[PDB]
Automatic annotation (TrEMBL), chains A, C, E, F:
This is Uncharacterized protein. It comes from Vibrio phage ICP1_2004_A.
Automatic annotation (TrEMBL), chains B, D:
The lineage of its organism: Viruses, Duplodnaviria, Heunggongvirae, Uroviricota, Caudoviricetes. It comes from Vibrio phage ICP1_2004_A. The chain holds residues 1 to 75 of 930 of the full protein. It comes from the Viruses. This is Uncharacterized protein.
DNA sequence: ATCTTCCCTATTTAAATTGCT
DNA sequence: AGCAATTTAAATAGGGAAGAT
């Protein structure tokens, strides 16, 4: 049975749209409605995503789940300001290791360690914005960005209440939305319905961030149902806490760049794959949720 | 590691090469697969392609060096 | 084809085989092999399962998981689970861990509560021996077997440590192996790598014994990695722990009959899902875990 | 400028392709050609792959996009 | 002929060794002695270096004559001790542009201008050194290289005799060898019989330089037997002026980096096709010899 | 298959057809299809010819070039060359433009000397006609053709400038077209873009004359881009210019004799090279280059 | 010799379908 | 839904073989 390729080293990531995911001749392959099929990985994919019109067979799910593939459905968000519901099937067949949410529910129940873990998972993104730089867009730490990341680190350190973390997080996301609007010279606001290239690409990128994260959390065991930034705006889980670490830092610059230089959907998809593998974004999330867990 | 597997085989053995290569790479064109593999997926895939049988003709180019050359593959 | 398994209140757990679960007239439907289209009772389902050879679209799952029914993948009988979501709260306007899991992890934190919970679950080993009685098995009320069940009762009402609780569990399961080998007039040592038929179908049935445990804990929300009797280093220990309820009381004499009549894997799988539906084992496990927590 | 031509055609109409695409493009393996060319080379190669016959299923990849879709190709 | 790729942006350079170059089904291919043919891009090639152990057919010279391929025969007489003779077959059937030669011979003849241009093929080296830059060798903004190019500048400018320009060229090349020797921390006396990887990659790169230099000679139409710099050490024509521009400024960093990083023979062969086309060391040599012709 | 063409006295062009020029037993040889290898003379050959179906190895190339003997490639017949290296003084100990090349440059680079050389190459017309009469067309010593000759032998000697020479050359070409039309009773208007057999056979003979003219200019290293008569923007004007001596004297009647008897294109080729081999008309053209340049 | 156009020969791929899980 | 056989054309290497230059 050997040892299987590790979850934190899996490379191809998919968001598969309009197909019929099936198994033909022992490989997962998605039947697009041309009559032609494309071979998809099943052992070197860390998630497949399923957009409008896709249909998964059971044997497809068998292969994917056994091999360790998070799967989620894109549509389901019906609100005006939130990505509401991403129904996600985690592979429960393989018994995931115990060592990590036996310590994560320990911090989840004691509210002072829950608060401190909320601080440290909120400094996740301020170190993620520093350790994964770009060669384009904003100067990673210029004047404005350094001012907000210092302001945020001070704000999260002085806050001992959970709605205050949500407030400072909201200012964080909204004012790098503003700063990336100024650096990419456009007027942009977050709305899941706007057909703005930026908005659209950022929605696809947050789907990708969901996946790496959901897979980060399967690999380490931790469920979604044990969040660490719960509140009024955030009703999605831990995924959307570990997912936005690599959204404000990895996704949003990539979405804005793919919006300016005329990238297609598949071009933004491929850019995600490449960049994430190069930065071992998943190895960051599995090896850094870990220090929240047992350290 | 960006490795590019080309299977220069005949159909009976090539569909079997396709089955285990499809786990780790994606199809690029005309029995040539090309994708990102980690560091040990390439070793697992080399063992899964060696045990395909007799008639495996697979080349694999990391950078432009031939990584593995299972069978009597053309240079 | 269509199946129905009991759960806490109603038979709200539907297993679908050999049908492309589609969506017709604003309602998720099933298009079977015969050609007949059925419909899903929206009040008699909040759980739905998909067996071998099915398919389901995005417009089917998004509609299906908005009214309150959650999709989970299985093998063929509706117990051996591949992939699923987490049974959280109302999954449209909220995302919280259930009340059912919270009492279990309050049991998990404290050593005394976890000890009393271990006493409880290991007492419903005896209860599941009593309540699922096998005409083709043994008379479980007789003196040679009642000695073993009072051995458990005397041990588990006197146990102060986990290490002696595991030993008393081991001498119980070993005495049931010896008595059940004495009834079929055979010699038997429990080995997981032996090529004899008795061990082969014991381990085979033990797999679906773990499968119903996965289905039962998924349903209560409990992550299968907070093991009571087993150690913290055992991956997915809680699976085998709630499977300890039935591994000696349904799965053991059925596996012995499967190796005593020569019933091979397929015939054994048939007998499994048969007894697993008629005498309601998943419902028995789900109120068993309830009673371990609600008290 | 880096292009990559894959010929998903039938073999008697693939030797006639391989006569003309290998005038400009290196053979990298299994009816796929990958190599360097100029823009007027692209124009001349498209013109002289159009004019060879029927069933000239040919895909050209500049970066990761497509340049030509000659024939009713699977892409 | 149609439009035909111009002889400035053909970008497939080859030195083939131990293979009969023939024509198979209208394709120029080298049949290696193992029995495998390998098709050559005969219309995207500027030169074919026929190294030790190869043979070319007349139909494989007809298809490399019309398509503008500089076929040179390398070894035997090409010991490159004094750069005596590489037997280099120019396609002579095509009537090349004639306004380049009728100005170049005017240059050659009037000695005053010869020196003025000699100086400029010698001033094109410091220009090729400053413009064409690498990212693995030395900084061209370094004080040692600035010192030696300034010494060569003041050597070229005040000298009014061909032996003095030969001595200035000589010391420029030799001290560049010594500067790259000291900066890469390796002894280096360039003897052509020495079989170290530094010297072998240098004499392979010099053959590449001969190939594109003689291609720039042929596309202009200028015959090699009209050298701007003739004397005792410098033999072989003006192709060793048009090669010795890129010799101190492209292939010597390329050869030194190729043997320092342990890159193989075919990997340096690949790198000296890629770089030779990324900044077009071809149309640089075309449009700058056109700057030399001019008046 | 193997043939000998004279250049001046004993330097001889050895056109090899259909062979394999490889080193056999130390020295070079050429294996034909009948299995007979022949050792080619080294002092009785200086320009060795490679016609259709011949392949030569690098050992043969290098050792042939190392002892004075210099290769060229050619099509079927030995007078349709396409690729070579230029003639030098000697290819081993020096590299220099040839003495014929230098003297031709002195002719081209003085207006009066280029003019007086132009009257010479125009006045080789009468000689070419007289030396090589055919049994096919008009004799040299008739009334009207010698009137055309007298028109040259008066007007060319005292023509002022170059467009006058072009005017007389046009009158001679369009005037022997009248004479050779009257011999074969047809009507001629010269158009290369026509489709009659006379014009297309004349333009095939024109290309066949351009080939040997190019070979005769190559045989002394005389560059093809130095026309005496055609303009400075005419590509390869010297090929046409030293072809015009044979174009109206041998080529025109041949193209016409051929068309009369209505033979084919290959039959044209073999009749051209037969008559072209009989009287050593190549050797006439080298004697004209020496008579033009040496003085 | 070299190349090519052919064609007859096996023979190597491929898609339709039965029968089952 | 998916996996094999299992024919079934049929498309496809390929090995002399005849003409050309």
């Amino acid at each position: 049975m050997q040892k299987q390729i590790l979850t934190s080293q899996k490379r191809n990531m998919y968001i598969l749209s309009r197909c019929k995911v099936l198994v033909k001749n022992g490989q997962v392959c998605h039947l697009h409605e041309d009559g032609n099929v494309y071979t998809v990985p099943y052992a070197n994919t860390v998630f497949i995503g399923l957009a409008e019109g896709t249909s998964i067979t059971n044997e497809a799910m068998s292969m994917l789940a056994a091999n360790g593939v998070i799967v989620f459905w894109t549509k389901g968000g019906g609100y005006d300001m939130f990505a509401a519901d991403i129904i996600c099937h985690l592979p429960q067949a393989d018994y995931r290791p115990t060592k990590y949410m036996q310590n994560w529910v320990r911090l989840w129940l004691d509210e002072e360690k829950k608060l401190s873990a909320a601080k440290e998972i909120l400094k996740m993104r301020v170190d993620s914005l520093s350790t994964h730089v770009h060669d384009f867009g904003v100067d990673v730490e210029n004047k404005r960005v350094s001012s907000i990341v210092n302001k945020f680190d001070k704000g999260v350190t002085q806050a001992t209440s959970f709605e205050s973390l949500l407030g400072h997080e909201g200012t964080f996301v909204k004012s790098l939305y503003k700063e990336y609007a100024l650096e990419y010279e456009i007027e942009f606001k977050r709305d899941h319905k706007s057909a703005d290239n930026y908005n659209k690409f950022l929605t696809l990128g947050n789907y990708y961030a969901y996946g790496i994260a959901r897979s980060s959390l399967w690999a380490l065991g931790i469920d979604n149902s044990f969040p660490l930034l719960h509140g009024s705006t955030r009703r999605g889980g831990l995924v959307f806490d570990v997912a936005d670490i690599i959204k404000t830092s990895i996704i949003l610059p990539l979405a804005f760049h793919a919006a300016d230089q005329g990238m297609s959907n598949t071009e933004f998809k491929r850019s995600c794959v490449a960049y994430f593998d190069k930065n071992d974004i998943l190895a960051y999330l599995i090896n850094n949720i870990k220090r929240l867990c047992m350290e | 590691m960006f490795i590019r597997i080309k299977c220069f085989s005949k159909q009976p053995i090539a569909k079997k090469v396709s089955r285990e290569v499809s786990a780790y790479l994606e199809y690029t064109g005309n029995n040539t697969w090309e994708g990102h593999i980690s560091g040990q997926g390439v070793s697992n895939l080399q063992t899964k392609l060696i045990n395909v049988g007799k008639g495996v003709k697979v080349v694999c180019n990391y950078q432009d060096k031939v990584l593995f050359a299972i069978g009597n593959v053309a240079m």
